[PDB]
Amino acid sequence: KARGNVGFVAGSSYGTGSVWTRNNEVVVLTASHVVGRANMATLKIGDAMLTLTFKKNGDFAEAVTTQSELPGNWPQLHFAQPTTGPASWCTATGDEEGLLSGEVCLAWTTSGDSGSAVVQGDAVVGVHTGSNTSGVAYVTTPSGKLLGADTVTLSSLSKHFTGPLTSIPKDIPDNIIADVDAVPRSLAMLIDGLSNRE
Numbered sequence: 001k002a003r004g005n006v007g008f009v010a011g012s013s014y015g016t017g018s019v020w021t022r023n024n025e026v027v028v029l030t031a032s033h034v035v036g037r038a039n040m041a042t043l044k045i046g047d048a049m050l051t052l053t054f055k056k057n058g059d060f061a062e063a064v065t066t067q068s069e070l071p072g073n074w075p076q077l078h079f080a081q082p083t084t085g086p087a088s089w090c091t092a093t094g095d096e097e098g099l100l101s102g103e104v105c106l107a108w109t110t111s112g113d114s115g116s117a118v119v120q121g122d123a124v125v126g127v128h129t130g131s132n133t134s135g136v137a138y139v140t141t142p143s144g145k146l147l148g149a150d151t152v153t154l155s156s157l158s159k160h161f162t163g164p165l166t167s168i169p170k171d172i173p174d175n176i177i178a179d180v181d182a183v184p185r186s187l188a189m190l191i192d193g194l195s196n197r198e
Contacts, residue, residue, distance in 0.1 A: 002092050005074050006116070007045030012036020015115035016092050016128070017043050019070065020077035026070045027077050028063040030115035031127050031140070032056040046072070058144030059129045061115070079142050080123035084160040086190055089128055089137070090117045094197030098137060099190050100125065101157065104175055105137040105148035108195035134173045135194055153177040161187040 009017040015034030020027045028043055035041040035054050042051045043063075050070055052063035087100035091113045098107025100118065109116070109131050116128040118139050126139040126147060138148040154168065154176060163185030168178065169192050 002094055003090050005045075005072075006090050006092055007043050008092055009034050009041050009043050009115055011041030012038070013114065014112055016090075016113055017045075017115055018090055018117035018124075019043070019045060019072070019074045020124075021074045022077040026065045026067055026074060028052055028054075028065065028070075029117055029124065029127055030054070030061050030063075031129055032059045032061040033129075034115045035061050043070075045070075048072075057140075057142065058146065059140040060127055060142050060144055062142070075122070078123040080120065080125055082125045082139075082141065082147055083120055084157070085120065086186075087118050087120045087125060089113065090119060091197060092116075096195070096197045097190070097193055098135075099187075100139065100147070101152060101160075102145075102147050103150035103152040104157070104173070105139050106135045106173070106191060106194075107131075107137040108135055108197075109137060132173070134171050135191075136173050136175070151175045151177055153179045154183055155180045158183050158187055161185075161190075163187075163189075 017030040054061040084101040089096040126141040129138040161184040165182040166188040
């Protein structure tokens with residue numbers, strides 16, 4: 001079951017969106033490539049169907065509308081810098097718990113999940129942009145920075161996680177440089193937690 005503010009978006013492609021409140025306006029986030037160059041796309045949430053125009057920054061797409069056009073108790077929109085740790089990919093079929101860092105992001109997603117808000121706590125860090133082999137995720141922040149395209153060692157990543165040393169999960173992407181033979185339990189369980197929205 002998806003979060004209450006998560007909807008489906010259809011433009012040049014099919015994706016996911018999220019709805020929020022900010023300074024008396026209703027804000028809708030999704031991915032630019034889901035919207036498409038014509039800059040128009042239709043959001044479906046609850047019984048509401050609304051066509052919107054989006055301002056874009058790289059693959060991060062944001063539309064604004066009003067309470068009279070899209071009523072509901074939408075959660076307040078807070079943007080925040082990425083913090084190395086767990087993050088929730090808010091897909092239309094439930095939250096996918098994944099690893100988020102500036103260099104590498106891991107989450108089990110499909111094409112339809114493009115545009116899902118990626119959140120940490122009560123704040124949006126970006127939208128889901130795309131995927132690669134072995135749970136690789138790419139996330140675009142509101143300022144248009146692409147997260148997930150660089151490399152990081154396991155030891156460097158490990159500094160950010162609590163718990164005792166644990167065996168490294170089997171399938172990890174080449175962009176995570178395996179330079180230790182054990183990682184903190186929370187890091188291992190995160191990666192092991194692959195595919196958890198059900």
